[PDB]
Amino acid sequence: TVHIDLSALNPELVQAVQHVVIGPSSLIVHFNEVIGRGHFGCVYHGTLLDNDGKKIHCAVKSLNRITDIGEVSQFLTEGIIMKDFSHPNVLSLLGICLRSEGSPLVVLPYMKHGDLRNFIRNETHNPTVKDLIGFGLQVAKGMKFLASKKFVHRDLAARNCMLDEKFTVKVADFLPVKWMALESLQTQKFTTKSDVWSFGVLLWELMTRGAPPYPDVNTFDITVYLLQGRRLLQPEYCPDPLYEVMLKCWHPKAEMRPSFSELVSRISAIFSTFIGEHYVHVNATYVNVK
Ligand SMILES: NC1CCN(Cc2ccn3ncnc(Oc4ccc(NC(=O)NC(=O)Cc5ccc(F)cc5)cc4F)c23)CC1
Numbered sequence: 001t002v003h004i005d006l007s008a009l010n011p012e013l014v015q016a017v018q019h020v021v022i023g024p025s026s027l028i029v030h031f032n033e034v035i036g037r038g039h040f041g042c043v044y045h046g047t048l049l050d051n052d053g054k055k056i057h058c059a060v061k062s063l064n065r066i067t068d069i070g071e072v073s074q075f076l077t078e079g080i081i082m083k084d085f086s087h088p089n090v091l092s093l094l095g096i097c098l099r100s101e102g103s104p105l106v107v108l109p110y111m112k113h114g115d116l117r118n119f120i121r122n123e124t125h126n127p128t129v130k131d132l133i134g135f136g137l138q139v140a141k142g143m144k145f146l147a148s149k150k151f152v153h154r155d156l157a158a159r160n161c162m163l164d165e166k167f168t169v170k171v172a173d174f175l176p177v178k179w180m181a182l183e184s185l186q187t188q189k190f191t192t193k194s195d196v197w198s199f200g201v202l203l204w205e206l207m208t209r210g211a212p213p214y215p216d217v218n219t220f221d222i223t224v225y226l227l228q229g230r231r232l233l234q235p236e237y238c239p240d241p242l243y244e245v246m247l248k249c250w251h252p253k254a255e256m257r258p259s260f261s262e263l264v265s266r267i268s269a270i271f272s273t274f275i276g277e278h279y280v281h282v283n284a285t286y287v288n289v290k
Pocket residue numbers: 035036038043058059060061082085090091108109110111112114115146153159160162171172173174
């Protein structure tokens with residue numbers, strides 16, 4: 001029972017929130033266990049009673065409160081944006097259950113290992129070149145899926161990719177100038193080819209085990225830096241063929257950049273050549289760098 005006129009939302013718009021709803025008669029939320037509140041909502045640990053037995057772990061997403069109906073359609077329209085995202089490498093929506101008491105919730109599958117960036121930066125973890133390339137391969141597969149749905153991410157980065165118990169990457173979304181294409185920096189226009197550029201930066205984050213891109217650069221003022229004729233350097237443990245792909249992702253002519261289908265293809269080949277014997281270590285010069 002909220003004190004806001006919600007049905008004044010977008011009928012012939014957000015009516016699909018029903019054929020996706022999952023009655024509270026099966027979802028248990030743990031408001032005491034907070035996994036993390038990014039900035040525009042609190043995320044807790046949750047459980048789902050699948051049908052009449054199967055219980056499953058998950059991450060419940062909720063918002064502040066009354067800042068009007070506008071932001072309620074924003075949190076909903078979005079969660080519904082994931083509804084059609086049926087791909088193993090894309091973070092999906094379990095459903096949306098409604099109490100309407102002052103904060104609707106979106107149910108996501110729990111990601112045991114959190115985000116790809118914190119996971120790889122972890123010194124207790126021991127990824128090989130193969131594992132890191134594999135994570136990158138999984139990201140390209142999800143992006144290949146998203147591009148096919150004509151969905152432009154606009155914010156692809158290791159911090160936005162989630163990792164689950166089976167080590168399956170789920171591309172997700174929790175101005176990032178350092179991941180932006182030259183043409184986007186200049187004309188604020190985002191495209192799939194601009195995601196490919198961000199994917200090239202993401203591969204660099206992976207091979208550097210989460211070092212921040214261009215530490216030394218003004219940020220913004222990245223445009224002037226790139227225009228001087230610069231790109232991120234090849235990480236120590238990055239295979240040449242992979243750096244070559246990174247260089248392609250950062251092509252000056254967007255249309256000249258490989259598609260995500262080509263990226264999956266190219267990267268699956270590179271990945272196939274490694275056996276898991278080359279361990280990737282952290283770079284002394286990147287450590288502690290923000
Ligand atoms: N970097 C942060 C740090 C905290 N961490 C919280 C966390 C830990 C474990 N989990 N498990 C699940 N979910 C956890 O948080 C969340 C992680 C992602 C989302 N995403 C959305 O709400 N929406 C989308 O992703 C939309 C979208 C989907 C696909 C796209 F290609 C583009 C956009 C919501 C969360 F709540 C969590 C998290 C990553």
